[PDB]
Design an enzyme around this catalytic site. Structure first.
Site, short mmCIF file in Angstrom:
data_model
loop_
_atom_site.label_atom_id
_atom_site.label_comp_id
_atom_site.label_asym_id
_atom_site.label_seq_id
_atom_site.Cartn_x
_atom_site.Cartn_y
_atom_site.Cartn_z
N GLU B 160 0.82 -1.21 0.00
CA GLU B 160 0.00 0.00 0.00
C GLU B 160 0.86 1.26 0.00
O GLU B 160 0.63 2.16 0.81
CB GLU B 160 -0.91 0.00 1.22
CG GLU B 160 -1.94 -1.12 1.14
CD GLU B 160 -3.05 -0.96 2.14
OE1 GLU B 160 -2.81 -0.40 3.23
OE2 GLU B 160 -4.17 -1.38 1.84
N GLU B 240 -6.30 -8.53 -0.79
CA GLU B 240 -6.73 -8.57 0.60
C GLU B 240 -8.23 -8.37 0.74
O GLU B 240 -8.72 -7.26 0.96
CB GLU B 240 -6.00 -7.52 1.46
CG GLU B 240 -4.49 -7.60 1.52
CD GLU B 240 -3.92 -6.59 2.49
OE1 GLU B 240 -4.72 -5.98 3.23
OE2 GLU B 240 -2.70 -6.36 2.52
C1 6DJ Z 1 -8.05 2.46 6.11
C2 6DJ Z 1 -6.87 1.88 6.88
C3 6DJ Z 1 -6.09 0.86 6.05
C4 6DJ Z 1 -4.71 0.49 6.63
N1 6DJ Z 1 -4.45 -0.81 6.01
C5 6DJ Z 1 -4.68 -1.93 6.57
S1 6DJ Z 1 -5.22 -2.15 8.16
C6 6DJ Z 1 -5.46 -3.89 7.98
C7 6DJ Z 1 -4.64 -4.30 6.75
C8 6DJ Z 1 -3.20 -4.74 7.10
O1 6DJ Z 1 -2.49 -3.75 7.85
C9 6DJ Z 1 -2.34 -4.85 5.86
O2 6DJ Z 1 -1.14 -5.62 5.99
C10 6DJ Z 1 -2.52 -3.72 4.82
O3 6DJ Z 1 -1.92 -4.10 3.58
C11 6DJ Z 1 -4.01 -3.36 4.63
N2 6DJ Z 1 -4.48 -3.09 5.97
#
Ligand code: 6DJ
Ligand code: 6DJ
Ligand code: NAG
Ligand code: NAG
Ligand code: NAG
Ligand code: NAG
Ligand code: NAG
Ligand code: NAG
Ligand code: NAG
Ligand code: NAG
Ligand code: CL
Ligand code: CL
Lengths: 605, 603
Positions: B160, B240
């Protein structure tokens, strides 16, 4: 210097000079796999029991004269060590007759080689064999005696001898003398009999402490008064306080209410009585070890007995109710109790017919048959347990149905009849002494006879088995027999020779495999095997004979399968020997299958 | 010879020249003990998954520069060969930053030795560390690629990145270049970002296949339309698909209803999209591996996630429901499924006080403390995780209360304050920057400071920890510090030297035996701390994580059976940081309880 005595002054046992009474539970090491010995004994400890009680089944240890089995599941010395290492005492009941719903009440079948032998008497041949057995067993037991460092505090001599017809006091005196010779003079020798003078009359002996047995249906005062008449001084003792009862194929499963077992236990303990709970865990009659009653009715595979610990060792409501009763009289160990084992439903496994019994004779009977003008019994033919095949030829055309019969009711106990490979049906001890057959003159008549268990109680424990008297066809005696003792156990372990040597269907063997994954901490697990569509037979898994199945009669539909015989990665081989009707003809193979489930059904219709 | 590739024509993966799509679940090897690896993977395969997906946390493998852990529970290569043996393909996510609700997003804290480091940028110090880590990790992953006989079919670059403020494209292109240098030219490289153009803007790169993430609350059509703007050709992929969601200490336990997951899944699968369920089993943040979000809130020890497999690997209603969904598209393997493990309530185990932290400093800090005029950070002082004691000497009298304060909110993340062995209370990041204290001039002032977990997401992943700005007493800056790094792990394993309102933070120990020769014991259990407050717990020297029954939602911690023994007593060690129920004359209250059911959703 360790001491265990009766104090006749104080109506009590003394243990190193200190007052003692026992709260014991029966557990039969011949009926629980060694793998689980410690599991059961520890659960028994945690219930508050300070001793356990067990039988030594002679036939379990000397299956032929001078050939002994004292290793693995047969290692009575080890079991007794485990008990001691857990801080439990032991009450040993070495018979030599034990009754116990066990084949011939524990007496070896080879005793019957003398046809006229009078069992449990001063018959010189019976005594000589007993004597040689005690010369082997008791010396092993001597260092396990309390006074020599081990757990054994009392020893029973015989078992409910007062219930037997013979009333031979010379026999009891001989037992006493030989137990004395091998175990010394300090050891407490006792007897057990029904709690009524009619039983005690022939069962009690001077020098052997008289104890009684009774369950929840008995008046306690009356029962112990009957004990006091023979032993006016010493501890009160109920050597078998029935927590449940035995079963027979075709009858409803026996239960005894928890509240009734608990209230009688409270009242017995309240008198300062030593008591043994029969059974505390009952366990299983693997292979062909079950017994029977007379008139001929065999006990089944499960020895669940409605015991406080269930067949597979589970803690039931009963266990906790009796633990609570005991807590009222004695400190119960602290800590968590080992659990009920997890059970796993492996599901449906398909089988397929490998070979008929008729086709497997070469592997079942590799030294060939015995030839005889009239039929010989199992014993004459050197087989004690399982199945023998009797073969002759029809001496007349039987194109019209002709009556095959045992006029004297000598089919002991069940025969599966074929003519030239066509199943004709079944002859049954007591119930059906005649069967109509068809076939051409000179056709081969086969009867596969099953020993369903030698009677373990009463006057007819001299149960030879097989065709014990003549067969007639159209009322004429059938002569010229070819008799094949069947080494079912070897044959099954070699996959009927396939692995080498490093309406009715024909009796036959059905086999299938199932795998279980390795690297899974919680597999394999205990399971229960069920046989929907099947009828009557024997079952093995990986060559371990789990016993007899008979869903046609019940009450037991499932058989207990302990985990330690199951393997991972390598295929598990199930072998079913079906005797009457297999669900495997139709071109639906999915019907030719068994099922592993996670709950027992020993209490159905 | 084996091929895996994107065919831009049929909008598809091709495996060995044949169309392929994947239905994967996330499993993090670092959150499941190796003892259970096969059990969780097998259960995954019996759900109908043809692949798994995992993250490689850098900090789990390189806790100091040049010092590697690839053995036992840290044996990634083994984890991947195991998945292959089971017939599972692998989607590998090597970061270097993985987020993951994990300490600093997988980034090792020693990166913060360069104070000004810009993490996840082309900061040349950050790149040189990453490059050395890739040069140790990716040659290990090379033979595990599909093209070379292994299970690995695609590899994610970064995580991300488009959600990160830095937007440094040169960083991504460096990662791409270095991944191609180590893994070769054929491996499918991809990126994952949120399903909206504002997130894809800084996340997508030329030559990395752009994929999206989204959960059950999203319009699936819009989600994939946003991927398609970046990649008009190739497979649709949700890397995911949220089966559940993360927790924070002090907030209600997240859950997502089975029906919603089933619906979106079937829907994603009918489109012919490859999908990964995040998480499939979540497992546990043992030790100090949890992360935190900004503004500061830590994630708890449990990483259950409301996954299909529970923390301890149990088959849930959700598991059976997704399996029934997958069955509609791909025949699922036959046989019975390995079961949920048996759980045993070991019961109440009594503990007694061993030593306060104050009195254990010989064994906790055998190098002696560091002196400093002002306070130093965890990083400056060479400790990454756990606790550090900061000690000074009151410069004026405080017979009447006096404000001890962190004016810039520099207690990172929580301090347990005592004056002359007398507990005063607690300072808390973002919540309590001032506490009243009392004592005589010259009295020892002690702050036991806890790193509660480095922020794993957002701008503030450069989270040094400790006293990161000065403290004041009656407005004047406190000076002359004696700071003790604490070797809690060593010290607990050696029994604090034995084996060569508030209470003072202290260790309490006690013992329990499990009988040998019982085929079904030991078993998994769950440990509970009724009356305790906040702390850390070890069993037989294995750090199970943090307890905090005073905030919830998690009250029990998972104890795997394999760390329990029957040849010798098992040792429980609690480090209670606020209030222990162990003063009163009833010693039976100074105890923990083992139960057979988890409570991860208390209110
Ligand atoms: C809107 C908040 C998104 C932050 N991203 C998250 S929180 C839960 C999941 C895991 O951390 C993950 O490993 C991220 O890639 C996507 N994600
Ligand atoms: C009704 C007559 C009683 C025969 N004895 C029995 S039936 C159940 C139990 C066990 O068989 C046992 O081994 C006997 O001692 C007592 N008993
Ligand atoms: C038992 O018999 C005694 C007399 O010996 C009597 O007092 C009592 O009423 C009896 N109890 C039962 C249950 O029959
Ligand atoms: C056998 O056959 C005869 C008819 O010949 C019949 O009278 C008798 O009932 C039959 N017996 C049995 C046991 O079925
Ligand atoms: C069978 O038949 C004959 C009677 O003719 C007899 O001599 C023999 O004892 C019988 N045998 C058995 C085993 O019944
Ligand atoms: C069952 O197991 C053994 C091989 O281990 C073999 O003799 C028999 O052929 C097997 N049958 C099947 C279907 O695996
Ligand atoms: C998603 O958006 C489309 C328009 O792009 C609309 O047709 C559809 O209903 C939406 N789906 C859902 C589940 O809201
Ligand atoms: C105690 O602390 C409170 C709030 O931090 C503060 O208002 C108060 O002044 C302190 N006590 C004294 C003596 O003032
Ligand atoms: C603390 O304050 C002093 C004096 O103003 C200053 O030198 C220093 O930068 C501060 N240190 C920290 C870590 O805040
Ligand atoms: C083991 O735990 C028990 C608790 O019953 C305790 O009494 C004993 O001191 C402990 N032994 C060791 C070696 O810590
Ligand atoms: Cl017994
Ligand atoms: Cl993942």
């Amino acid at each position: 210097q360790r001491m265990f005595e009766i104090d006749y002054s104080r109506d009590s046992f003394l243990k190193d000079g200190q007052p003692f009474r026992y709260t014991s539970g029966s557990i039969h090491y011949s009926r629980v796999p060694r793998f689980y010995w410690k599991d059961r004994l520890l659960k028994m400890k945690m219930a508050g029991l300070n001793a356990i009680q067990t039988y030594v089944p002679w036939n379990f240890h000397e299956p032929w004269p001078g050939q002994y089995q004292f290793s693995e599941d047969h290692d009575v010395e080890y079991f007794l060590r485990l008990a001691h290492e857990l801080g439990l005492l032991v009450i040993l009941r070495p018979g030599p007759y034990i009754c116990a719903e066990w084949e011939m009440g524990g007496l070896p079948a080879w005793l019957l080689e003398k046809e006229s032998i009078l069992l449990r008497s001063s018959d010189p041949d019976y005594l000589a064999a007993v004597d040689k057995w005690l010369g082997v067993l008791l010396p092993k037991m001597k260092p396990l005696l309390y006074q020599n460092g081990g757990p054994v505090i009392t020893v029973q001599v015989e078992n409910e001898y007062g219930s037997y017809f013979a009333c031979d006091f010379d026999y009891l005196r001989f037992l006493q003398k030989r137990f004395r010779h091998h175990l010394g003079d300090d050891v407490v020798l006792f007897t057990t009999d029904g709690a009524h003078k009619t039983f005690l009359k022939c069962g009690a002996l001077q020098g052997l402490y008289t104890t009684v047995d009774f369950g929840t249906g008995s008046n306690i005062t009356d029962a112990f008064l009957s004990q006091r008449k023979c032993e006016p001084k010493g501890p009160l003792i109920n050597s078998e306080f029935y927590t449940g009862w035995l079963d027979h194929w075709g009858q409803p499963h026996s239960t005894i209410k928890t509240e009734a077992v608990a209230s009688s236990l409270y009242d017995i303990l309240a008198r300062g009585a030593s008591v043994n709970l029969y059974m505390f865990i009952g366990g299983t009659n693997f292979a062909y070890w079950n017994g029977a009653n007379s008139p001929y009715a065999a006990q089944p595979t499960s020895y669940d007995y409605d015991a406080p610990l269930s067949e597979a060792g589970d803690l039931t409501e009963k266990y906790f109710a009796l633990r609570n009763i005991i807590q009222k009289f004695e400190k119960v160990p602290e800590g968590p109790i080992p659990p009920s084992t997890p059970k796993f439903a492996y599901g449906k496994v398909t089988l397929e017919k490998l070979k008929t019994v008729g086709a497997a004779l070469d592997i079942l009977c590799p030294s060939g048959p015995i030839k005889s003008l009239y039929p010989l019994t199992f014993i004459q033919v050197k087989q004690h347990y399982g199945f023998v095949l009797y073969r002759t030829t029809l001496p007349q055309d039987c194109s019209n149905p002709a009556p095959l019969s045992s006029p004297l009711n000598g089919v002991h106990d069940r025969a599966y009849v074929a003519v030239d490979g066509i199943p004709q049906g079944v002859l049954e001890r007591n119930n059906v002494i005649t069967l109509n057959i068809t076939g051409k003159a000179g056709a081969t008549l086969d009867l596969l006879v099953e020993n369903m268990g030698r009677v373990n109680y009463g006057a007819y424990i001299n149960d030879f088995k097989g065709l014990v008297s003549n067969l007639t066809l159209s009322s004429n005696i059938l002569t010229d027999w070819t008799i094949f003792p069947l080494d079912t156990e070897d044959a099954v372990r070699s996959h009927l020779g396939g692995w080498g040597h490093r309406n009715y269907t024909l009796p036959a063997f059905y086999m299938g495999n199932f795998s279980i994954p390795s690297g899974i901490p919680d597999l394999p697990q205990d399971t229960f095997i069920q046989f929907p569509g099947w009828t009557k037979g024997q079952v093995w898994i990986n060559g371990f004979n789990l016993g007899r199945y008979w869903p046609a009669r019940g009450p037991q539909l499932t058989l207990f399968v302990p985990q330690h015989i199951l393997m991972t990665s390598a295929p598990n081989t199930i072998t079913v020997l079906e005797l009457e009707w297999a669900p495997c003809s139709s071109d639906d193979p999915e019907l030719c299958a068994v099922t592993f489930v996670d709950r027992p059904v020993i209490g159905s219709s």
